[PDB]
Amino acid sequence: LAILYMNSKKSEAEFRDYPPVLRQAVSLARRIQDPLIEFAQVCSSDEDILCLKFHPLQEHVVKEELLNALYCEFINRVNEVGVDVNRAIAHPYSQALIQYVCGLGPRKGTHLLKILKQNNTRLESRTQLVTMCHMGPKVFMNCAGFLKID
Amino acid sequence: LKPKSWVRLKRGIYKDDIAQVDYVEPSQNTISLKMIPRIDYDRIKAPPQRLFDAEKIRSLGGDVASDGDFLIFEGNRYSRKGFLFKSFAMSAVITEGVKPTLSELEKF
Amino acid sequence: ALETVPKDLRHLRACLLCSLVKTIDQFEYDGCDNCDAYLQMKGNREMVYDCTSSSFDGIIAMMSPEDSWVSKWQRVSNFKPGVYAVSVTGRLPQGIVRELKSRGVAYKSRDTAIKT
Amino acid sequence: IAFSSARDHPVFCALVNGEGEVTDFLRLPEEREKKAQDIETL
Ligand SMILES: [Zn+2]
Numbered sequence: 213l214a215i216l217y218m219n220s221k222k223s224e225a226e227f228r229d230y231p232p233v234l235r236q237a238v239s240l241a242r243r244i245q246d247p248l249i250e251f252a253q254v255c256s257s258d259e260d261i262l263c264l265k266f267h268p269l270q271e272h273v274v275k276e277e278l279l280n281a282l283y284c285e286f287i288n289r290v291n292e293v294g295v296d297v298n299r300a301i302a303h304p305y306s307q308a309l310i311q312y313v314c315g316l317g318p319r320k321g322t323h324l325l326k327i328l329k330q331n332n333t334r335l336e337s338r339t340q341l342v343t344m345c346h347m348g349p350k351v352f353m354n355c356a357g358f359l360k361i362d
Numbered sequence: 363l364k365p366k367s368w369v370r371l372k373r374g375i376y377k378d379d380i381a382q383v384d385y386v387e388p389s390q391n392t393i394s395l396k397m398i399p400r401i402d403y404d405r406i407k408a409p410p411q412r413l414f415d416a417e418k419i420r421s422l423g424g425d426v427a428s429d430g431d432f433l434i435f436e437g438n439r440y441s442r443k444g445f446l447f448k449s450f451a452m453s454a455v456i457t458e459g460v461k462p463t464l465s466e467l468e469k470f
Numbered sequence: 471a472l473e474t475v476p477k478d479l480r481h482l483r484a485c486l487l488c489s490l491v492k493t494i495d496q497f498e499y500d501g502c503d504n505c506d507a508y509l510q511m512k513g514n515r516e517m518v519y520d521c522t523s524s525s526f527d528g529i530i531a532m533m534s535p536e537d538s539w540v541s542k543w544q545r546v547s548n549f550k551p552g553v554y555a556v557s558v559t560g561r562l563p564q565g566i567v568r569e570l571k572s573r574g575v576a577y578k579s580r581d582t583a584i585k586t
Numbered sequence: 587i588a589f590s591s592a593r594d595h596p597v598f599c600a601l602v603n604g605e606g607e608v609t610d611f612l613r614l615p616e617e618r619e620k621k622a623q624d625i626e627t628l
Pocket residue numbers: 485486487488489490502503504505
């Protein structure tokens with residue numbers, strides 16, 4: 213995974229002067245703390261996650277089905293671990309996780325973070341989601357359990 | 363060299379950067395400008411233009427003083443509502459030969 | 471006489487009514503030679519910086535303003551011989567321009583420059 | 587700590603704080619004297 217992050221354009225953006233091997237070092241240091249966070253943070257897209265070698269024959273399986281199966285395992289893990297929106301606002305690294313929170317995704321998540329950022333305030337309570345943001349009752353029903361608040 | 367105008371920087375780290383002048387001190391000693399920082403904050407040393415944010419910077423350390431939406435740090439880095447308002451030196455900024463495009467109108 | 475010519479070419483500014491160029495301390499100490507009864511900028515700096523601007527282009531040293539083409543095109547022919555700016559940027563505040571109109575002086579913009 | 591082929595290639599390491607931010611990094615580039623100084627700086 214650190215090789216993948218080292219090669220990723222994201223690492224270039226985050227560390228422009230650092231040599232490639234220095235980028236592996238930070239990714240390894242992040243992975244040991246929490247592989248879920250690092251894996252989700254580097255595997256931004258389908259083209260990225262497919263670079264890891266899960267099985268020698270993975271290139272031959274149907275991509276729509278493989279990607280769905282892998283993201284389903286990410287969704288499961290992110291919902292078991294939960295996501296802290298406050299640290300996601302303060303620290304962009306965790307912003308990747310909400311995409312996998314059930315009931316949410318890129319469109320809804322980026323909107324939610326954009327609002328919370330623009331307001332410059334942490335979520336004091338989960339009721340703040342429907343109060344401050346414009347998310348509907350059913351998505352709130354789905355995701356409220358999986359959203360942590362320190 | 364008048365307020366509400368558009369100027370560009372020539373020397374220093376702010377190479378070829380488009381900025382805007384908001385207010386000029388009646389003493390004409392220093393001038394206030396709207397700009398985007400290019401420093402690393404002492405972590406890359408032993409970068410492109412992107413908007414400043416006031417929360418990822420407060421953990422590296424240093425003398426940081428926050429009073430709500432107003433922040434002061436690292437040699438009076440005047441800041442308000444997430445934007446920097448520190449003043450520039452007249453020799454480093456060039457006023458003529460800018461001719462701003464629509465993209466600048468959306469940044470500030 | 472030479473009291474009207476810049477003492478030093480450091481800190482030069484052009485009056486914004488008559489475009490006469492002098493050093494900041496020359497205006498502050500002696501005042502503007504052509505325009506004093508309608509503006510009254512002698513004895514303070516607040517009025518000086520409100521009306522008078524440092525942002526001017528070129529200088530024309532006018533030796534015989536009475537008999538010169540450059541003096542006509544520039545509307546300085548009835549002024550005293552001295553150094554003038556070719557073009558000064560800015561506009562008077564919304565107080566003296568009204569007072570000037572009230573006193574019968576038609577304030578016309580010294581910003582001769584064409585935009586782009 | 588990360589590295590490569592090592593044939594005339596250095597070893598790099600980065601200290602990452604609990605929040606995920608990175609601190610100042612260290613470069614670790616007959617052999618006994620060089621390794622001894624590398625060990626000492628480490
Ligand atoms: Zn005058």
